[PDB]
Structures are given as structure tokens and as C-alpha cells.
């Protein structure tokens, strides 16, 4: 029947925490084999907003819309890594593909949450062009660090933001 938004956010946060843990584990596996010297970034990745000062009902549609968009970008990047990241990263399977499938599940859950709560849906956006292949094997490894680290941060701020917002529902 009418969903309880608090319970729905609780459920969504639990699944986000699961994906956060998977992402953290894969990032540490990657650093064990290919250590990183510096925080790595990629221009094609979303800029994370890190909103959590004061969040309430008015902000919920926007937070969820932005999360959906960000997670879809991370999915594109994860798929790109698996296909074109270079042989150096074949060792990250099958875990990277499992992460991809779980990200898909969370994306489905977010669209359903928005539908059941009758929240305004984003306009069908123009899909981003293909990602260029890495310019080198080490460039591909740095991109993997950037992708897993950025996904981790996105999921951490989603957990934080959604739980804070829930306190005002
Ligand atoms: Cl399920």
C-alpha cells in the first residue's frame, strides 16, 4: 500500500552499505597488487556533491536523482574497466563483474523507490559517448583506483545523506 518513506530509505541504505563494503574490499584488493601513490581522479567521473549539512524532505527527490545519475556513471566506468582496462586488471575478476551486477540491483531499487513514492522522475538524459581506452597500462590502473575510490565515496555519502534526511521524515 502507501509506502513508509522511512522504512524504504532504511531498506535502500542497507543495500547501499552492502555495495559500499564490496567496493571497499575490491579497492583494497587492487591496492594490494597495484599500490597507489596519490589520490587518483578521472575527468569522466561525476563530481561528488557531499551534501549532508541539513537535509530534509524537500531535498529527497534531488538527492535520489543525483545518486541515480552518479551510480549509472560508475556502472559505465566499471563496465569500461572490465572491457578495456588492460590485461593488468584481469585479476580483479570475477569481483568487478559481481560489483557491476550489484550496482545494477541498487539502481533498480532506486528507480522503484522513486516510483512508489511518486517522486518526480528525471528527464531521459542523453547517454554519454564511449569512454576512450586507457592511454597506457598504468593509466588504466590509476583509472581503476579512481573508479573504485570514487564509487566508495559516492556510496558513503549516500548512506550518510539518506540517514540524515530520514531523521526529518
Ligand atoms: Cl531482490
mmCIF file with all atom_site columns, C-alpha atoms and ligand atoms in Angstrom:
data_model
loop_
_atom_site.group_PDB
_atom_site.id
_atom_site.type_symbol
_atom_site.label_atom_id
_atom_site.label_alt_id
_atom_site.label_comp_id
_atom_site.label_asym_id
_atom_site.label_entity_id
_atom_site.label_seq_id
_atom_site.pdbx_PDB_ins_code
_atom_site.Cartn_x
_atom_site.Cartn_y
_atom_site.Cartn_z
_atom_site.occupancy
_atom_site.B_iso_or_equiv
_atom_site.pdbx_formal_charge
_atom_site.auth_seq_id
_atom_site.auth_comp_id
_atom_site.auth_asym_id
_atom_site.auth_atom_id
_atom_site.pdbx_PDB_model_num
ATOM   1   C  CA  . UNK A 1 1   ? 0.000  0.000   0.000   1.00 0.00 ? 1   UNK A CA  1
ATOM   2   C  CA  . UNK A 1 2   ? 1.254  3.538   0.757   1.00 0.00 ? 2   UNK A CA  1
ATOM   3   C  CA  . UNK A 1 3   ? 4.980  3.073   1.322   1.00 0.00 ? 3   UNK A CA  1
ATOM   4   C  CA  . UNK A 1 4   ? 6.565  4.202   4.514   1.00 0.00 ? 4   UNK A CA  1
ATOM   5   C  CA  . UNK A 1 5   ? 9.338  6.519   3.307   1.00 0.00 ? 5   UNK A CA  1
ATOM   6   C  CA  . UNK A 1 6   ? 11.389 5.956   6.445   1.00 0.00 ? 6   UNK A CA  1
ATOM   7   C  CA  . UNK A 1 7   ? 11.308 2.162   6.061   1.00 0.00 ? 7   UNK A CA  1
ATOM   8   C  CA  . UNK A 1 8   ? 12.009 2.449   2.331   1.00 0.00 ? 8   UNK A CA  1
ATOM   9   C  CA  . UNK A 1 9   ? 15.043 4.628   2.996   1.00 0.00 ? 9   UNK A CA  1
ATOM   10  C  CA  . UNK A 1 10  ? 16.209 2.163   5.658   1.00 0.00 ? 10  UNK A CA  1
ATOM   11  C  CA  . UNK A 1 11  ? 15.994 -0.693  3.122   1.00 0.00 ? 11  UNK A CA  1
ATOM   12  C  CA  . UNK A 1 12  ? 17.821 1.308   0.461   1.00 0.00 ? 12  UNK A CA  1
ATOM   13  C  CA  . UNK A 1 13  ? 20.574 2.238   2.905   1.00 0.00 ? 13  UNK A CA  1
ATOM   14  C  CA  . UNK A 1 14  ? 21.127 -1.418  3.871   1.00 0.00 ? 14  UNK A CA  1
ATOM   15  C  CA  . UNK A 1 15  ? 21.634 -2.373  0.216   1.00 0.00 ? 15  UNK A CA  1
ATOM   16  C  CA  . UNK A 1 16  ? 23.920 0.657   -0.290  1.00 0.00 ? 16  UNK A CA  1
ATOM   17  C  CA  . UNK A 1 17  ? 26.038 -0.393  2.687   1.00 0.00 ? 17  UNK A CA  1
ATOM   18  C  CA  . UNK A 1 18  ? 26.411 -3.856  1.118   1.00 0.00 ? 18  UNK A CA  1
ATOM   19  C  CA  . UNK A 1 19  ? 27.681 -2.340  -2.134  1.00 0.00 ? 19  UNK A CA  1
ATOM   20  C  CA  . UNK A 1 20  ? 29.937 0.035   -0.182  1.00 0.00 ? 20  UNK A CA  1
ATOM   21  C  CA  . UNK A 1 21  ? 31.532 -2.939  1.564   1.00 0.00 ? 21  UNK A CA  1
ATOM   22  C  CA  . UNK A 1 22  ? 32.019 -4.758  -1.771  1.00 0.00 ? 22  UNK A CA  1
ATOM   23  C  CA  . UNK A 1 23  ? 33.613 -1.655  -3.283  1.00 0.00 ? 23  UNK A CA  1
ATOM   24  C  CA  . UNK A 1 24  ? 35.915 -1.152  -0.291  1.00 0.00 ? 24  UNK A CA  1
ATOM   25  C  CA  . UNK A 1 25  ? 37.048 -4.765  -0.482  1.00 0.00 ? 25  UNK A CA  1
ATOM   26  C  CA  . UNK A 1 26  ? 37.831 -4.575  -4.200  1.00 0.00 ? 26  UNK A CA  1
ATOM   27  C  CA  . UNK A 1 27  ? 39.681 -1.259  -3.775  1.00 0.00 ? 27  UNK A CA  1
ATOM   28  C  CA  . UNK A 1 28  ? 41.871 -2.835  -1.089  1.00 0.00 ? 28  UNK A CA  1
ATOM   29  C  CA  . UNK A 1 29  ? 42.492 -5.912  -3.252  1.00 0.00 ? 29  UNK A CA  1
ATOM   30  C  CA  . UNK A 1 30  ? 43.536 -3.578  -6.061  1.00 0.00 ? 30  UNK A CA  1
ATOM   31  C  CA  . UNK A 1 31  ? 45.897 -1.607  -3.803  1.00 0.00 ? 31  UNK A CA  1
ATOM   32  C  CA  . UNK A 1 32  ? 47.436 -4.863  -2.527  1.00 0.00 ? 32  UNK A CA  1
ATOM   33  C  CA  . UNK A 1 33  ? 48.501 -5.821  -6.075  1.00 0.00 ? 33  UNK A CA  1
ATOM   34  C  CA  . UNK A 1 34  ? 48.954 -2.342  -7.630  1.00 0.00 ? 34  UNK A CA  1
ATOM   35  C  CA  . UNK A 1 35  ? 49.801 0.175   -4.885  1.00 0.00 ? 35  UNK A CA  1
ATOM   36  C  CA  . UNK A 1 36  ? 48.819 3.781   -5.477  1.00 0.00 ? 36  UNK A CA  1
ATOM   37  C  CA  . UNK A 1 37  ? 50.905 6.881   -4.736  1.00 0.00 ? 37  UNK A CA  1
ATOM   38  C  CA  . UNK A 1 38  ? 48.405 9.739   -4.550  1.00 0.00 ? 38  UNK A CA  1
ATOM   39  C  CA  . UNK A 1 39  ? 44.631 10.195  -4.772  1.00 0.00 ? 39  UNK A CA  1
ATOM   40  C  CA  . UNK A 1 40  ? 43.619 9.398   -8.346  1.00 0.00 ? 40  UNK A CA  1
ATOM   41  C  CA  . UNK A 1 41  ? 40.846 11.114  -10.296 1.00 0.00 ? 41  UNK A CA  1
ATOM   42  C  CA  . UNK A 1 42  ? 39.234 10.868  -13.729 1.00 0.00 ? 42  UNK A CA  1
ATOM   43  C  CA  . UNK A 1 43  ? 37.578 13.677  -15.674 1.00 0.00 ? 43  UNK A CA  1
ATOM   44  C  CA  . UNK A 1 44  ? 34.808 11.426  -16.961 1.00 0.00 ? 44  UNK A CA  1
ATOM   45  C  CA  . UNK A 1 45  ? 33.600 10.648  -13.436 1.00 0.00 ? 45  UNK A CA  1
ATOM   46  C  CA  . UNK A 1 46  ? 30.923 12.650  -11.678 1.00 0.00 ? 46  UNK A CA  1
ATOM   47  C  CA  . UNK A 1 47  ? 31.815 15.404  -9.270  1.00 0.00 ? 47  UNK A CA  1
ATOM   48  C  CA  . UNK A 1 48  ? 30.587 14.251  -5.867  1.00 0.00 ? 48  UNK A CA  1
ATOM   49  C  CA  . UNK A 1 49  ? 28.460 16.855  -4.051  1.00 0.00 ? 49  UNK A CA  1
ATOM   50  C  CA  . UNK A 1 50  ? 28.956 15.665  -0.441  1.00 0.00 ? 50  UNK A CA  1
ATOM   51  C  CA  . UNK A 1 51  ? 25.704 17.230  0.775   1.00 0.00 ? 51  UNK A CA  1
ATOM   52  C  CA  . UNK A 1 52  ? 24.796 16.428  4.372   1.00 0.00 ? 52  UNK A CA  1
ATOM   53  C  CA  . UNK A 1 53  ? 24.700 19.664  6.346   1.00 0.00 ? 53  UNK A CA  1
ATOM   54  C  CA  . UNK A 1 54  ? 20.935 19.905  6.625   1.00 0.00 ? 54  UNK A CA  1
ATOM   55  C  CA  . UNK A 1 55  ? 18.776 17.549  4.591   1.00 0.00 ? 55  UNK A CA  1
ATOM   56  C  CA  . UNK A 1 56  ? 15.030 17.170  4.796   1.00 0.00 ? 56  UNK A CA  1
ATOM   57  C  CA  . UNK A 1 57  ? 12.026 16.178  2.743   1.00 0.00 ? 57  UNK A CA  1
ATOM   58  C  CA  . UNK A 1 58  ? 12.467 18.998  0.217   1.00 0.00 ? 58  UNK A CA  1
ATOM   59  C  CA  . UNK A 1 59  ? 15.892 17.657  -0.728  1.00 0.00 ? 59  UNK A CA  1
ATOM   60  C  CA  . UNK A 1 60  ? 14.985 13.982  -1.099  1.00 0.00 ? 60  UNK A CA  1
ATOM   61  C  CA  . UNK A 1 61  ? 13.968 13.914  -4.795  1.00 0.00 ? 61  UNK A CA  1
ATOM   62  C  CA  . UNK A 1 62  ? 17.116 15.768  -5.779  1.00 0.00 ? 62  UNK A CA  1
ATOM   63  C  CA  . UNK A 1 63  ? 19.396 13.584  -3.678  1.00 0.00 ? 63  UNK A CA  1
ATOM   64  C  CA  . UNK A 1 64  ? 17.919 10.432  -5.204  1.00 0.00 ? 64  UNK A CA  1
ATOM   65  C  CA  . UNK A 1 65  ? 18.020 11.822  -8.761  1.00 0.00 ? 65  UNK A CA  1
ATOM   66  C  CA  . UNK A 1 66  ? 21.694 12.736  -8.375  1.00 0.00 ? 66  UNK A CA  1
ATOM   67  C  CA  . UNK A 1 67  ? 22.558 9.352   -6.834  1.00 0.00 ? 67  UNK A CA  1
ATOM   68  C  CA  . UNK A 1 68  ? 20.906 7.527   -9.725  1.00 0.00 ? 68  UNK A CA  1
ATOM   69  C  CA  . UNK A 1 69  ? 22.876 9.555   -12.239 1.00 0.00 ? 69  UNK A CA  1
ATOM   70  C  CA  . UNK A 1 70  ? 26.146 9.102   -10.367 1.00 0.00 ? 70  UNK A CA  1
ATOM   71  C  CA  . UNK A 1 71  ? 25.730 5.348   -9.925  1.00 0.00 ? 71  UNK A CA  1
ATOM   72  C  CA  . UNK A 1 72  ? 24.878 4.949   -13.622 1.00 0.00 ? 72  UNK A CA  1
ATOM   73  C  CA  . UNK A 1 73  ? 28.102 6.751   -14.474 1.00 0.00 ? 73  UNK A CA  1
ATOM   74  C  CA  . UNK A 1 74  ? 30.045 4.456   -12.141 1.00 0.00 ? 74  UNK A CA  1
ATOM   75  C  CA  . UNK A 1 75  ? 28.383 1.465   -13.803 1.00 0.00 ? 75  UNK A CA  1
ATOM   76  C  CA  . UNK A 1 76  ? 29.530 2.715   -17.220 1.00 0.00 ? 76  UNK A CA  1
ATOM   77  C  CA  . UNK A 1 77  ? 33.074 3.113   -15.858 1.00 0.00 ? 77  UNK A CA  1
ATOM   78  C  CA  . UNK A 1 78  ? 33.131 -0.325  -14.204 1.00 0.00 ? 78  UNK A CA  1
ATOM   79  C  CA  . UNK A 1 79  ? 31.993 -1.911  -17.463 1.00 0.00 ? 79  UNK A CA  1
ATOM   80  C  CA  . UNK A 1 80  ? 34.638 0.097   -19.335 1.00 0.00 ? 80  UNK A CA  1
ATOM   81  C  CA  . UNK A 1 81  ? 37.338 -1.166  -16.944 1.00 0.00 ? 81  UNK A CA  1
ATOM   82  C  CA  . UNK A 1 82  ? 36.323 -4.795  -17.419 1.00 0.00 ? 82  UNK A CA  1
ATOM   83  C  CA  . UNK A 1 83  ? 36.320 -4.449  -21.180 1.00 0.00 ? 83  UNK A CA  1
ATOM   84  C  CA  . UNK A 1 84  ? 39.244 -2.143  -21.906 1.00 0.00 ? 84  UNK A CA  1
ATOM   85  C  CA  . UNK A 1 85  ? 41.203 -1.560  -18.687 1.00 0.00 ? 85  UNK A CA  1
ATOM   86  C  CA  . UNK A 1 86  ? 44.051 -3.782  -19.859 1.00 0.00 ? 86  UNK A CA  1
ATOM   87  C  CA  . UNK A 1 87  ? 45.271 -7.273  -19.073 1.00 0.00 ? 87  UNK A CA  1
ATOM   88  C  CA  . UNK A 1 88  ? 46.794 -5.971  -15.863 1.00 0.00 ? 88  UNK A CA  1
ATOM   89  C  CA  . UNK A 1 89  ? 43.335 -5.959  -14.303 1.00 0.00 ? 89  UNK A CA  1
ATOM   90  C  CA  . UNK A 1 90  ? 42.041 -9.390  -15.344 1.00 0.00 ? 90  UNK A CA  1
ATOM   91  C  CA  . UNK A 1 91  ? 42.970 -10.313 -11.761 1.00 0.00 ? 91  UNK A CA  1
ATOM   92  C  CA  . UNK A 1 92  ? 40.085 -8.151  -10.488 1.00 0.00 ? 92  UNK A CA  1
ATOM   93  C  CA  . UNK A 1 93  ? 37.550 -10.536 -11.910 1.00 0.00 ? 93  UNK A CA  1
ATOM   94  C  CA  . UNK A 1 94  ? 35.189 -12.004 -11.173 1.00 0.00 ? 94  UNK A CA  1
ATOM   95  C  CA  . UNK A 1 95  ? 34.722 -9.499  -8.384  1.00 0.00 ? 95  UNK A CA  1
ATOM   96  C  CA  . UNK A 1 96  ? 34.452 -6.467  -10.692 1.00 0.00 ? 96  UNK A CA  1
ATOM   97  C  CA  . UNK A 1 97  ? 31.633 -8.100  -12.639 1.00 0.00 ? 97  UNK A CA  1
ATOM   98  C  CA  . UNK A 1 98  ? 29.837 -9.049  -9.441  1.00 0.00 ? 98  UNK A CA  1
ATOM   99  C  CA  . UNK A 1 99  ? 30.121 -5.448  -8.297  1.00 0.00 ? 99  UNK A CA  1
ATOM   100 C  CA  . UNK A 1 100 ? 28.588 -4.380  -11.615 1.00 0.00 ? 100 UNK A CA  1
ATOM   101 C  CA  . UNK A 1 101 ? 25.622 -6.701  -11.160 1.00 0.00 ? 101 UNK A CA  1
ATOM   102 C  CA  . UNK A 1 102 ? 25.052 -5.436  -7.614  1.00 0.00 ? 102 UNK A CA  1
ATOM   103 C  CA  . UNK A 1 103 ? 25.254 -1.823  -8.772  1.00 0.00 ? 103 UNK A CA  1
ATOM   104 C  CA  . UNK A 1 104 ? 22.524 -2.683  -11.309 1.00 0.00 ? 104 UNK A CA  1
ATOM   105 C  CA  . UNK A 1 105 ? 20.377 -4.043  -8.496  1.00 0.00 ? 105 UNK A CA  1
ATOM   106 C  CA  . UNK A 1 106 ? 20.789 -0.851  -6.474  1.00 0.00 ? 106 UNK A CA  1
ATOM   107 C  CA  . UNK A 1 107 ? 19.918 1.266   -9.492  1.00 0.00 ? 107 UNK A CA  1
ATOM   108 C  CA  . UNK A 1 108 ? 16.700 -0.740  -9.955  1.00 0.00 ? 108 UNK A CA  1
ATOM   109 C  CA  . UNK A 1 109 ? 15.841 -0.276  -6.278  1.00 0.00 ? 109 UNK A CA  1
ATOM   110 C  CA  . UNK A 1 110 ? 16.310 3.499   -6.524  1.00 0.00 ? 110 UNK A CA  1
ATOM   111 C  CA  . UNK A 1 111 ? 14.023 3.891   -9.543  1.00 0.00 ? 111 UNK A CA  1
ATOM   112 C  CA  . UNK A 1 112 ? 11.410 1.759   -7.824  1.00 0.00 ? 112 UNK A CA  1
ATOM   113 C  CA  . UNK A 1 113 ? 11.686 3.824   -4.609  1.00 0.00 ? 113 UNK A CA  1
ATOM   114 C  CA  . UNK A 1 114 ? 11.066 6.970   -6.632  1.00 0.00 ? 114 UNK A CA  1
ATOM   115 C  CA  . UNK A 1 115 ? 8.112  5.436   -8.482  1.00 0.00 ? 115 UNK A CA  1
ATOM   116 C  CA  . UNK A 1 116 ? 6.417  4.082   -5.358  1.00 0.00 ? 116 UNK A CA  1
ATOM   117 C  CA  . UNK A 1 117 ? 6.818  7.414   -3.654  1.00 0.00 ? 117 UNK A CA  1
ATOM   118 C  CA  . UNK A 1 118 ? 5.508  9.244   -6.735  1.00 0.00 ? 118 UNK A CA  1
ATOM   119 C  CA  . UNK A 1 119 ? 8.564  11.465  -6.812  1.00 0.00 ? 119 UNK A CA  1
ATOM   120 C  CA  . UNK A 1 120 ? 9.269  13.446  -9.982  1.00 0.00 ? 120 UNK A CA  1
ATOM   121 C  CA  . UNK A 1 121 ? 11.376 11.325  -12.362 1.00 0.00 ? 121 UNK A CA  1
ATOM   122 C  CA  . UNK A 1 122 ? 14.409 12.847  -14.138 1.00 0.00 ? 122 UNK A CA  1
ATOM   123 C  CA  . UNK A 1 123 ? 14.097 13.528  -17.885 1.00 0.00 ? 123 UNK A CA  1
ATOM   124 C  CA  . UNK A 1 124 ? 15.614 10.828  -20.153 1.00 0.00 ? 124 UNK A CA  1
ATOM   125 C  CA  . UNK A 1 125 ? 19.133 12.233  -20.349 1.00 0.00 ? 125 UNK A CA  1
ATOM   126 C  CA  . UNK A 1 126 ? 21.424 11.898  -23.373 1.00 0.00 ? 126 UNK A CA  1
ATOM   127 C  CA  . UNK A 1 127 ? 23.748 8.936   -22.798 1.00 0.00 ? 127 UNK A CA  1
ATOM   128 C  CA  . UNK A 1 128 ? 27.422 9.794   -22.560 1.00 0.00 ? 128 UNK A CA  1
ATOM   129 C  CA  . UNK A 1 129 ? 29.682 8.945   -25.522 1.00 0.00 ? 129 UNK A CA  1
ATOM   130 C  CA  . UNK A 1 130 ? 32.039 5.982   -25.253 1.00 0.00 ? 130 UNK A CA  1
ATOM   131 C  CA  . UNK A 1 131 ? 34.982 6.227   -22.938 1.00 0.00 ? 131 UNK A CA  1
ATOM   132 C  CA  . UNK A 1 132 ? 38.353 6.320   -24.667 1.00 0.00 ? 132 UNK A CA  1
ATOM   133 C  CA  . UNK A 1 133 ? 40.609 3.308   -23.938 1.00 0.00 ? 133 UNK A CA  1
ATOM   134 C  CA  . UNK A 1 134 ? 43.332 3.908   -21.341 1.00 0.00 ? 134 UNK A CA  1
ATOM   135 C  CA  . UNK A 1 135 ? 46.421 5.507   -22.784 1.00 0.00 ? 135 UNK A CA  1
ATOM   136 C  CA  . UNK A 1 136 ? 48.703 3.026   -21.004 1.00 0.00 ? 136 UNK A CA  1
ATOM   137 C  CA  . UNK A 1 137 ? 48.597 0.058   -18.666 1.00 0.00 ? 137 UNK A CA  1
ATOM   138 C  CA  . UNK A 1 138 ? 49.497 2.241   -15.708 1.00 0.00 ? 138 UNK A CA  1
ATOM   139 C  CA  . UNK A 1 139 ? 46.897 4.784   -16.815 1.00 0.00 ? 139 UNK A CA  1
ATOM   140 C  CA  . UNK A 1 140 ? 44.315 2.005   -16.663 1.00 0.00 ? 140 UNK A CA  1
ATOM   141 C  CA  . UNK A 1 141 ? 45.397 1.028   -13.141 1.00 0.00 ? 141 UNK A CA  1
ATOM   142 C  CA  . UNK A 1 142 ? 45.184 4.640   -11.977 1.00 0.00 ? 142 UNK A CA  1
ATOM   143 C  CA  . UNK A 1 143 ? 41.708 4.797   -13.530 1.00 0.00 ? 143 UNK A CA  1
ATOM   144 C  CA  . UNK A 1 144 ? 40.682 1.696   -11.566 1.00 0.00 ? 144 UNK A CA  1
ATOM   145 C  CA  . UNK A 1 145 ? 41.823 3.355   -8.333  1.00 0.00 ? 145 UNK A CA  1
ATOM   146 C  CA  . UNK A 1 146 ? 39.845 6.481   -9.276  1.00 0.00 ? 146 UNK A CA  1
ATOM   147 C  CA  . UNK A 1 147 ? 36.694 4.493   -10.178 1.00 0.00 ? 147 UNK A CA  1
ATOM   148 C  CA  . UNK A 1 148 ? 36.630 2.290   -7.093  1.00 0.00 ? 148 UNK A CA  1
ATOM   149 C  CA  . UNK A 1 149 ? 37.580 5.137   -4.767  1.00 0.00 ? 149 UNK A CA  1
ATOM   150 C  CA  . UNK A 1 150 ? 35.000 7.467   -6.238  1.00 0.00 ? 150 UNK A CA  1
ATOM   151 C  CA  . UNK A 1 151 ? 32.303 4.812   -6.070  1.00 0.00 ? 151 UNK A CA  1
ATOM   152 C  CA  . UNK A 1 152 ? 33.189 4.142   -2.455  1.00 0.00 ? 152 UNK A CA  1
ATOM   153 C  CA  . UNK A 1 153 ? 32.878 7.833   -1.593  1.00 0.00 ? 153 UNK A CA  1
ATOM   154 C  CA  . UNK A 1 154 ? 29.578 8.195   -3.509  1.00 0.00 ? 154 UNK A CA  1
ATOM   155 C  CA  . UNK A 1 155 ? 28.093 5.274   -1.566  1.00 0.00 ? 155 UNK A CA  1
ATOM   156 C  CA  . UNK A 1 156 ? 29.437 6.558   1.787   1.00 0.00 ? 156 UNK A CA  1
ATOM   157 C  CA  . UNK A 1 157 ? 27.826 9.975   1.244   1.00 0.00 ? 157 UNK A CA  1
ATOM   158 C  CA  . UNK A 1 158 ? 24.587 8.305   0.107   1.00 0.00 ? 158 UNK A CA  1
ATOM   159 C  CA  . UNK A 1 159 ? 24.375 6.312   3.341   1.00 0.00 ? 159 UNK A CA  1
ATOM   160 C  CA  . UNK A 1 160 ? 25.168 9.445   5.351   1.00 0.00 ? 160 UNK A CA  1
ATOM   161 C  CA  . UNK A 1 161 ? 22.781 11.718  3.490   1.00 0.00 ? 161 UNK A CA  1
ATOM   162 C  CA  . UNK A 1 162 ? 19.818 9.342   3.333   1.00 0.00 ? 162 UNK A CA  1
ATOM   163 C  CA  . UNK A 1 163 ? 20.055 8.511   7.037   1.00 0.00 ? 163 UNK A CA  1
ATOM   164 C  CA  . UNK A 1 164 ? 20.236 12.199  7.950   1.00 0.00 ? 164 UNK A CA  1
ATOM   165 C  CA  . UNK A 1 165 ? 17.317 13.002  5.704   1.00 0.00 ? 165 UNK A CA  1
ATOM   166 C  CA  . UNK A 1 166 ? 15.313 10.152  7.289   1.00 0.00 ? 166 UNK A CA  1
ATOM   167 C  CA  . UNK A 1 167 ? 15.637 11.820  10.709  1.00 0.00 ? 167 UNK A CA  1
ATOM   168 C  CA  . UNK A 1 168 ? 13.478 14.694  9.347   1.00 0.00 ? 168 UNK A CA  1
ATOM   169 C  CA  . UNK A 1 169 ? 10.778 12.477  7.858   1.00 0.00 ? 169 UNK A CA  1
HETATM 170 CL CL1 . LIG B 2 .   ? 15.832 -8.823  -4.646  1.00 0.00 ? 1   LIG B CL1 1
#
